[PDB]
């Protein structure tokens, strides 16, 4: 399509360019994944192959980890801080992906 409205998302706070729709991961057949903590708060997980523009904080962690097989590190915004979603790893096919809290993120128009 000509002038696509749907390609980034940015942090919601800042700006930070942070994914693309067309990096959408369908984890266990579908990108979103609706999650809660144990603190109680449900997360609308898109998961995405691949991001920028994050902070992963600290090392990895099993702990209550919504996806099977994979350790998590949180991800920030790198640039206000915003907490974002989480980063992946340890597991298989693929071994590292992102999961990002939706309503954290704007989407809009391309570069
Ligand atoms: O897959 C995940 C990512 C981390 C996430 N997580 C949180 O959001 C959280 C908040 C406070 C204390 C502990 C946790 C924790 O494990 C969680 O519960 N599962
Ligand atoms: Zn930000």
Same mark, same amino acid.
């Given at each position: 399509v000509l002038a696509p409205g749907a390609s980034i998302f940015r942090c919601? %706070?800042? #700006?930070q360019t942070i994914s693309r729709r067309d990096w959408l991961l369908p984890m266990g057949g579908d990108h979103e994944h609706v999650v809660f903590n144990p603190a109680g708060m449900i997360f609308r997980v898109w998961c995405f192959s691949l991001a920028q523009g994050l902070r992963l904080i600290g090392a990895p962690s099993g702990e !209550? +980890?919504? !996806?099977?097989g994979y350790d998590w590190t949180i991800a920030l915004c790198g640039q206000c801080g915003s907490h974002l979603g989480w980063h992946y790893e340890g #597991? +298989? %096919?693929? %071994?590292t992906f992102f999961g990002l809290i939706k309503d954290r993120l704007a989407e809009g128009p391309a570069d």
């Open positions: 919601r %706070q800042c #700006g !209550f +980890s919504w !996806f099977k #597991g +298989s %096919q693929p %071994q």
